[PDB]
Motif scaffolding. Structure first.
Motif, PDB file in Angstrom:
ATOM      1  N   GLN A  65      26.266 -13.554  -5.648  1.00 54.59           N
ATOM      2  CA  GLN A  65      25.210 -13.988  -6.228  1.00 54.59           C
ATOM      3  C   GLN A  65      25.261 -14.469  -7.729  1.00 54.59           C
ATOM      4  OE1 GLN A  65      21.392 -11.435  -4.138  1.00 54.59           O
ATOM      5  NE2 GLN A  65      23.113 -10.506  -4.895  1.00 54.59           N
ATOM      6  N   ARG A  70      -6.643  -1.164   3.536  1.00 56.86           N
ATOM      7  CA  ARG A  70      -6.702  -2.589   2.597  1.00 56.86           C
ATOM      8  C   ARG A  70      -5.680  -3.671   3.408  1.00 56.86           C
ATOM      9  NH1 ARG A  70     -11.210  -0.991   0.475  1.00 56.86           N
ATOM     10  NH2 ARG A  70     -10.845   0.605  -1.339  1.00 56.86           N
ATOM     11  N   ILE A  71      -4.203  -2.983   3.823  1.00 56.11           N
ATOM     12  CA  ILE A  71      -3.501  -4.249   4.728  1.00 56.11           C
ATOM     13  C   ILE A  71      -4.349  -4.645   6.214  1.00 56.11           C
ATOM     14  CG2 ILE A  71      -1.438  -4.008   5.891  1.00 56.11           C
ATOM     15  CD1 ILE A  71      -0.783  -1.935   3.412  1.00 56.11           C
ATOM     16  N   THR A  78      -0.923  -0.055  -9.115  1.00 55.60           N
ATOM     17  CA  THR A  78       0.194   0.397  -8.503  1.00 55.60           C
ATOM     18  C   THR A  78       1.308   0.784  -9.600  1.00 55.60           C
ATOM     19  OG1 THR A  78      -0.355  -0.915  -6.633  1.00 55.60           O
ATOM     20  CG2 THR A  78       1.713   0.065  -6.462  1.00 55.60           C
ATOM     21  N   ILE A 113       3.226   3.984 -10.192  1.00 51.31           N
ATOM     22  CA  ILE A 113       4.560   4.228 -10.194  1.00 51.31           C
ATOM     23  C   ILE A 113       5.178   4.660 -11.520  1.00 51.31           C
ATOM     24  CG2 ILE A 113       6.607   2.606 -10.528  1.00 51.31           C
ATOM     25  CD1 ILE A 113       5.584   1.563  -7.738  1.00 51.31           C
ATOM     26  N   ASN A 168       6.108  -4.496   5.335  1.00 54.18           N
ATOM     27  CA  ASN A 168       5.788  -4.123   4.153  1.00 54.18           C
ATOM     28  C   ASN A 168       6.409  -2.716   3.983  1.00 54.18           C
ATOM     29  OD1 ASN A 168       2.578  -5.855   3.950  1.00 54.18           O
ATOM     30  ND2 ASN A 168       4.466  -6.213   3.078  1.00 54.18           N
ATOM     31  N   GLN A 210      -2.885  -8.094  -2.015  1.00 52.79           N
ATOM     32  CA  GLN A 210      -4.136  -8.864  -1.517  1.00 52.79           C
ATOM     33  C   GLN A 210      -4.753  -8.301  -0.283  1.00 52.79           C
ATOM     34  OE1 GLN A 210      -3.557 -11.336   1.712  1.00 52.79           O
ATOM     35  NE2 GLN A 210      -1.503 -12.030   1.322  1.00 52.79           N
ATOM     36  N   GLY A 211      -6.027  -8.666  -0.069  1.00 50.41           N
ATOM     37  CA  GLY A 211      -6.971  -8.160   1.000  1.00 50.41           C
ATOM     38  C   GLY A 211      -7.282  -6.933   0.870  1.00 50.41           C
ATOM     39  N   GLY A 212      -7.746  -6.372  -0.380  1.00 52.63           N
ATOM     40  CA  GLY A 212      -8.249  -5.249  -0.696  1.00 52.63           C
ATOM     41  C   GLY A 212      -9.680  -5.571  -1.298  1.00 52.63           C
ATOM     42  N   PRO A 220      -5.046 -14.669   3.484  1.00 53.74           N
ATOM     43  CA  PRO A 220      -6.182 -14.002   3.516  1.00 53.74           C
ATOM     44  C   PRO A 220      -6.833 -13.349   2.023  1.00 53.74           C
ATOM     45  CG  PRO A 220      -4.607 -12.720   4.597  1.00 53.74           C
ATOM     46  CD  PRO A 220      -4.121 -13.979   4.179  1.00 53.74           C
ATOM     47  N   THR A 254      18.218 -11.688  -7.079  1.00 57.85           N
ATOM     48  CA  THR A 254      17.382 -11.098  -5.982  1.00 57.85           C
ATOM     49  C   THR A 254      16.852  -9.862  -6.768  1.00 57.85           C
ATOM     50  OG1 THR A 254      19.118 -10.349  -4.960  1.00 57.85           O
ATOM     51  CG2 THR A 254      18.114 -12.412  -4.159  1.00 57.85           C
ATOM     52  N   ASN A 293      11.310  -0.996  -5.679  1.00 62.08           N
ATOM     53  CA  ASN A 293      10.275  -0.890  -4.595  1.00 62.08           C
ATOM     54  C   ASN A 293       9.368  -2.375  -4.556  1.00 62.08           C
ATOM     55  OD1 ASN A 293      10.013   1.800  -3.920  1.00 62.08           O
ATOM     56  ND2 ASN A 293       9.504   2.341  -6.049  1.00 62.08           N
ATOM     57  N   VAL A 294       9.303  -2.952  -3.397  1.00 64.04           N
ATOM     58  CA  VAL A 294       8.711  -4.094  -2.933  1.00 64.04           C
ATOM     59  C   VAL A 294       6.929  -3.755  -2.796  1.00 64.04           C
ATOM     60  CG1 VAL A 294       8.459  -6.104  -1.721  1.00 64.04           C
ATOM     61  CG2 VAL A 294      10.790  -5.416  -2.402  1.00 64.04           C
ATOM     62  N   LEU A 295       6.155  -4.496  -3.213  1.00 63.90           N
ATOM     63  CA  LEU A 295       4.725  -4.406  -3.055  1.00 63.90           C
ATOM     64  C   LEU A 295       4.470  -4.900  -1.635  1.00 63.90           C
ATOM     65  CD1 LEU A 295       3.123  -5.235  -6.576  1.00 63.90           C
ATOM     66  CD2 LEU A 295       4.027  -2.861  -5.768  1.00 63.90           C
ATOM     67  N   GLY A 296       4.320  -6.031  -1.446  1.00 62.10           N
ATOM     68  CA  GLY A 296       4.090  -6.659  -0.528  1.00 62.10           C
ATOM     69  C   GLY A 296       2.806  -7.306  -0.138  1.00 62.10           C
ATOM     70  N   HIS A 297       2.261  -7.103   0.950  1.00 61.37           N
ATOM     71  CA  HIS A 297       0.961  -7.831   1.396  1.00 61.37           C
ATOM     72  C   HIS A 297      -0.365  -6.822   0.763  1.00 61.37           C
ATOM     73  CE1 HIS A 297       3.103 -10.545   3.597  1.00 61.37           C
ATOM     74  NE2 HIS A 297       2.154 -11.077   3.899  1.00 61.37           N
ATOM     75  N   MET A 298       0.180  -5.685   0.354  1.00 64.38           N
ATOM     76  CA  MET A 298      -0.688  -4.578  -0.181  1.00 64.38           C
ATOM     77  C   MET A 298      -1.459  -5.238  -1.502  1.00 64.38           C
ATOM     78  SD  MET A 298       0.792  -2.029  -2.851  1.00 64.38           S
ATOM     79  CE  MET A 298      -0.843  -2.237  -3.580  1.00 64.38           C
ATOM     80  N   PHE A 358      11.868   1.449 -12.547  1.00 68.21           N
ATOM     81  CA  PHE A 358      11.424   0.936 -11.132  1.00 68.21           C
ATOM     82  C   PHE A 358      11.297  -0.560 -11.155  1.00 68.21           C
ATOM     83  CE2 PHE A 358       9.774   5.402 -10.451  1.00 68.21           C
ATOM     84  CZ  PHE A 358      10.302   5.519  -9.119  1.00 68.21           C
ATOM     85  N   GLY A 382     -10.204  -9.576   2.738  1.00 69.24           N
ATOM     86  CA  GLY A 382      -9.736 -10.297   3.743  1.00 69.24           C
ATOM     87  C   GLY A 382     -10.407 -11.867   4.082  1.00 69.24           C
ATOM     88  N   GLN A 418      -7.519  -5.097   6.327  1.00 72.64           N
ATOM     89  CA  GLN A 418      -8.372  -6.152   6.062  1.00 72.64           C
ATOM     90  C   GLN A 418      -7.690  -7.497   5.830  1.00 72.64           C
ATOM     91  OE1 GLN A 418     -11.692  -5.025   3.832  1.00 72.64           O
ATOM     92  NE2 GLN A 418     -10.739  -3.263   2.555  1.00 72.64           N
ATOM     93  N   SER A 419      -6.497  -7.625   5.667  1.00 72.52           N
ATOM     94  CA  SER A 419      -5.602  -8.697   5.410  1.00 72.52           C
ATOM     95  C   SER A 419      -5.350  -8.964   7.021  1.00 72.52           C
ATOM     96  CB  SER A 419      -4.379  -8.562   4.693  1.00 72.52           C
ATOM     97  OG  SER A 419      -3.871  -7.196   4.892  1.00 72.52           O
TER      98      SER A 419
END
Lengths: 738, 735, 174
Positions: free
Chosen positions: C71, A545-546, B541, B545, A647, B653-655, B400, B625, B646-651, B557, B453, A548-549
């Motif tokens: 912070q 999926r990444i 997600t 988690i 990521n 989008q683009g699915g 995207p 933060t 935990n940070v998701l990120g660009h995961m 989390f 995408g 596709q981005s």
């Protein structure tokens, strides 16, 4: 090595998922070590005609097909090739492009036609030169044709190996439908019946029903015992008493009874109303089992065999018989095609007669184990007939909340219940052991546990070193004489601490077994762990999926940091299935020059149509070369050609619905682990070093290795074993990305 | 409202998200200080009683938000229909003081509660007549207020746009098509699907529009005369026009000209006698009712779960029974007496022909989706196209976002059917300056629905710095119209194109903007293309988690979701996933609100739900933060709960494009092209550079000249939004 | 400031430089002690001294790091003071030693050499000893009996003498 000759790949007959991953590795391998590789469209239908169906393949033509199910080549019904009436024209097109090596990806009758093409290769060549169409020197230059077969049918009809390409992907589509029904039949009391794709081989109906925990399976090889209509209605009535309002009946495509009459799903629907009276909706999964994205297990298997078949082509001398490459263990081997067809002829021979027992044992060793384990797990003998041994066996989940650990407790208790032992449950791992929380659990308590991630019992990464006397107090007040641990490296360290406590505390002299359950394969002495395929399928799908981005925002490379501590099992295997351009693990030393060489490779690939980049990294690959270092280096060294992002995945890799592989994996090794416990329990002297072993995997069969000898091949500083098996795939992975 | 007691029950049809409805109903009643009671087995539990009437708490409706179906048990009673058994059912409610009923059922069970509110004065007077109850009970518990909730995938009850279980059942239909769209590309073939809905056919209209089918069979509007010859021609037209995959979506009770249903077996025989294509019939059984509920349904069930409780205490003793439903962005309530009439009207409208009015009765959503699919799957010949000699080009500028390709497929096919030649400005504004423009046709956007995408390519590059290349490249390809499908970067570009009107004359053409981003920060628009894809991905997600957070007892989390400064993915992700806290930028917070959440989270560890889901915006604050929340929760939570981050990120989008965005991009893009054709008739004013947004229920074209005030250029978010009203609704659902 | 887990440079540094707070590892502190320092700092901005100095040990807390204090002070003081952060590197152990260390290195090294010439028990645990400062004079303590009054996990002794100065300092701040 070998170069100069041409390789011809084709996909005919049975076309399953991951077949595009096979031709991806077949094409990219023949370019890296040999000369030209050619596509043969429509399978055998393109050989007869040709012209446009035989085209040259390049490195940029098998990229974006890794995440596409089915086959990009295609296939159809070819009646002009199986008979020797138009096959001469099929043998006339390979001489044009100089194709003297063939590679068939079928698994059914397509592999049989390849052997008939090699035997007739010395007969069709003399006829084509006699008709005045080919050159005299060509009839001797290309007088020898080496072929290689690759399985790719979800029916698993090829009884040669155990697991083929498409079995894991088709099983995913079966469980995905079952998991959906598991959230609806809880409203109205009903019972569903599913028809899986198992015509001539019921391997799909066995492991899929074992994963979802079905009640009764209809196999085309092992028929039900005479009188199953009255026995299944009583069995279905028992589940109504165990508060199991959901019943699953898995039927094969051609499941037969005592005679050769197939048992259709409509007959079962007419049977649950004559003695039970429940609601039943028949469901038949047609071609939806063959569809979907290929699983991580198939993307690796097709890529591994996508390399081995090319190796088994130029290395194969012109006098060796046709070989069907199959993966089994550490190193893949080549199986002769003439001997594999012999086993198919013997399977159909025993299936026609009433000697069905010889047909089940001939199918393979995994089918016999899957049939014996499920029959002892699904069929529960009455409570008044349980041979109780007056012994308490305990199960515990210690470590990371890996998927499938909820299914390992299901197989451990019900096997021990039928073995004749009352079952105790230690909640919250070793932290609960020192705190208590020991409670008896039975058959109805683990009802439907297969399908939930994490741990209902509870897991903890706490070593039982300091809190030791508190565990001994709970070991005597409950009279625990056996303990089974389901976890990762924390379970291996805990069992070693329990070995040094036998000289101190006395209740620790009881037999014990650890089952690998981690999302990193860092368990020493074992090559596989529960939750590996769950995380592997999660990473590769998310990384897809990444992509596709990236395939959109052109000229973009994504840096992804996976988990796993130091074991790069999720990084290396995840990069092989997701097509990552590079995977930086700790076991592979890398410097600034090798890191820059990957940047130079990326800048050249951006000029092609594939203007994307996927690079993985284990969280502890290097103390200095961190994840941001790859992001900071790839950006400045490509500011005018490709940008990059970062990521960090995290705990999203683990957890979730347990993978179909992890479903059956945890249900099998945990069943044999209790068999060791029951056998060691029968001794009317318990202080030994062979009572603290870890049920590991060597090649194909299981092995019980004690922790007293695992101290040598382990690394306590890096939490990983010294020599790992998947490190042999290190050169196989980097050669698929140039 | 307080002091009263509410009794929730589920009877009749079931659907995904039913557990999400009772989760909000119970937690809302406890927050206002009202007793909540579970009524098992539907109406049968009221007659039996004893153990079927159990009290609910805050720990009982947890860990079930992600479970499909219902945990109470949708049953079909029979003794409650009689007044003899109804007297025992009424006295069972008087034991626990239940004076308010909440029936979250399918359709038919909602009528039984209406007869119970009229016989309340007759049954209560009969208990005091028998002496089993005290005279104060018939006066204190004198009147019974009832409320209904649509909870069935049949969607037979009209009056609203979407009901509970529609998007979830739509997800299960699309998920099967995606398993074929990436499989049937090896050999030419045609799949025939069968969806549920005997007298509604709404599931077959939006799913086929999302997947881009070729022919649909609806119970309302029957196929045209001679459809056996028109459908075979359409399936043969795509055979030679680069389309090796045809989808035929059929309803459960799709009728023809008469009352004879068109079974899927006749369609199988129709394509095998004159077409010869390999066709496999696939009847989607009860799998449409299964699977995890979608993020849109979990928010819908959580919103109506609170709206159903406030519709009971506020209900006057003389008010009619009502069925709560969503009405755009601010839901309303509908009377039960009038909702049944619309069901009987549609039936009679379907009986004896009159199908022409059955489509208009289903509302504007059905009429809008029917017109969109009819003008997208039916392509008139090229020689019959009135060419206007105008060049219309599409472009994707920004992130995207998923479903962006589904919007271009509709933007090009509608533009060709209107009488124009379509272009494709690749790479966004980066390719606009480079010159990446190529003419595309109808067969070029084949099968684009279902690919996340971007295919054209998008870049966050804005003009001005490259405006000299944009002005030159525009006057070469004869570009007369512009359509941008992107996020906030597309809004900042249209503002720069408005200032370059006199210095550059070629920028005086009408330019319409279509929102397409997961941040949902586009000013003038409530929703955005790709927002539901990330929303369904973040909550999924979080579920994977929370599973590890439930496995390892006492774990929290800290999850950081993307979206820039907009807290759409954080707030909606916190409501659909049941998060304990969702810190966004629009809602400030100090260390006191942070410590109050830890004390709120500390008391949760004493119950059975020893977990914790907390989300944080991508840039909610420059000081607090993601590591700040992780460090505070680890130190202040020492000894009571461990915590990670935990940070998701660009995961996100683009699915895989969610079925909502598969139709969202296909709907508003066809309307955006109509806005172009309406203006491409004869430029010098500000009504030419506008954006397409969502006000309440319909769409509106807001010019970017006036949008400069209601936006925050310092944070790329609009000043006033719509989902901020759900902030108190989300905070009250976390203890 | 550096110093490992010993807050000697943070405690004595905050007393001489006049810091309003000095978070060391030897004194535990939660978010209430952190917020009280901010609420007392907001009242200081209404007087003539519109500045603020706060010290922190190199490893005083596993979660309350240097960026955590920066912070929290920035957001909780938005509009009353704008705070910054700075990390002191190896410049603390600079070049020219202090005149006190010039005599400290010479005074106790001569007594350490006089202990060598005096003894050379012979093969025990007191032949290996240290040279510590008791009150005014020096003391030779063997390294064997110096295990119960030290913490090997943090490389600092258990009971420290300058911890009795923590009652002070505060009274000189707010």
């Amino acid at each position: 090595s070998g170069a100069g000759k041409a390789i011809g790949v084709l996909t005919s007959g049975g076309d399953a998922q991951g077949m595009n991953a096979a031709v991806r590795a077949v094409v990219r391998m023949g370019i890296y070590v040999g000369a030209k590789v050619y596509f043969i469209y429509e399978g055998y239908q393109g050989m007869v005609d040709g012209g446009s169906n035989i085209a040259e393949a390049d490195w940029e033509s098998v990229s974006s097909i890794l995440q596409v199910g089915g086959t990009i080549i295609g296939s159809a019904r070819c009646q002009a090739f199986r008979t020797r009436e138009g096959r001469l024209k099929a043998a006339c097109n390979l001489l044009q492009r100089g194709i003297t090596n063939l590679c068939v990806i079928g698994g059914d009758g397509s592999l049989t036609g390849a052997n008939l093409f090699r035997k007739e290769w010395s007969g069709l060549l003399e006829e084509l030169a006699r008709n005045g169409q080919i050159d005299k020197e060509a009839v001797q230059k290309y007088a020898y044709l080496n072929v290689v077969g690759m399985v790719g049918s979800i029916d698993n009809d090829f009884c040669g190996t155990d697991m083929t390409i498409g079995t894991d992907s088709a099983l995913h589509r079966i469980i995905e439908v079952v998991d959906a029904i598991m959230t609806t039949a809880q409203s109205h009391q009903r019972t569903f019946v599913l028809e899986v794709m198992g015509r001539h081989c019921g391997y799909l109906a066995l492991v899929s029903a074992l994963a979802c925990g079905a009640d009764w399976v209809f196999l085309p090889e092992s028929p039900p015992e005479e009188g199953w209509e009255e026995q299944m209605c009583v069995k279905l009535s028992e589940n109504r008493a165990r508060k199991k309002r959901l019943n699953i009946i898995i039927v094969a495509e051609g499941a037969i009874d005592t005679q050769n009459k197939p048992i259709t799903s409509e007959k079962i629907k007419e049977l649950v109303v004559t003695q039970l009276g429940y609601d039943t909706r028949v469901t038949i999964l047609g071609h939806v089992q063959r569809g979907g994205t290929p699983s991580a297990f198939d993307r690796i298997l097709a890529s591994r065999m996508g390399v081995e078949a090319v190796i088994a082509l130029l290395e194969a001398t012109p006098d060796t018989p046709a070989c069907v490459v199959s993966l089994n263990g550490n190193h893949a081997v080549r199986l002769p095609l003439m001997e594999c067809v012999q086993m198919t002829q013997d399977v159909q021979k025993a299936m026609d007669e009433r000697r069905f027992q010889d047909a089940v044992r001939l199918r393979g060793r995994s089918f016999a184990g899957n049939l014996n384990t499920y029959k002892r797990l699904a069929i529960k003998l009455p409570d008044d007939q349980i041979p109780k041994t007056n012994c308490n066996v305990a199960v515990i989940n210690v470590g990371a909340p890996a998927a499938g650990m909820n299914a390992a407790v299901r197989s451990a208790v019900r096997v021990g219940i039928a073995d004749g032992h009352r079952m105790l449950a230690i909640y919250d791992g070793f932290d609960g052991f020192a705190k208590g929380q020991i409670k008896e659990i039975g058959w109805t308590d683990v009802g439907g546990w297969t399908g939930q991630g994490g741990s209902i019992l509870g897991t903890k990464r706490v070593l039982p070193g300091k809190y030791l006397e508190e565990i001994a107090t709970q070991m005597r007040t409950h009279s625990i004489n056996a303990l089974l641990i389901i976890g990762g490296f924390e379970a291996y360290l805990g069992l070693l601490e329990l070995s040094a406590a036998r000289e101190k505390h006395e209740e620790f002299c009881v037999p014990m077994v650890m089952v690998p359950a981690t999302v990193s394969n860092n368990v020493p002495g074992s090559d596989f762990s529960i939750g590996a395929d769950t995380a592997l399928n999660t990473i590769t799908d998310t990384c897809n999926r990444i992509k596709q981005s990236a395939s959109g925002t052109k000229r973009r490379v994504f840096i992804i940091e996976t988990m796993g501590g130091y074991c790069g099992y999720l990084a290396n295997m995840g990069g092989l299935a997701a097509g990552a351009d590079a995977a930086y693990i700790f076991e592979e030393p890398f410097d600034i020059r090798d890191l820059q060489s990957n940047v130079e490779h990326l800048t050249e690939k951006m000029k092609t149509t594939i203007q994307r980049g996927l690079v993985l990294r284990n969280e502890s690959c290097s103390e200095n070369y961190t994840t941001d270092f790859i992001y900071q280096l790839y950006s400045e060294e490509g500011k005018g050609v490709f940008d990059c992002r970062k990521n960090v995945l995290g705990h999203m890799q683990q957890g979730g619905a347990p993978s179909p592989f992890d479903r059956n994996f945890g249900t099998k090794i945990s069943a044999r682990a209790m068999e060791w416990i029951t056998a060691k329990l029968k001794e009317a002297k318990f202080t030994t070093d062979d009572s603290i072993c870890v049920l590991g995997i060597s090649k194909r069969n299981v092995i019980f290795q004690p922790v007293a000898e695992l101290k040598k091949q382990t690394d306590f500083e890096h939490r990983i074993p010294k020599e790992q098996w998947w490190l042999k795939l290190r050169p196989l992975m980097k050669i698929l990305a140039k």
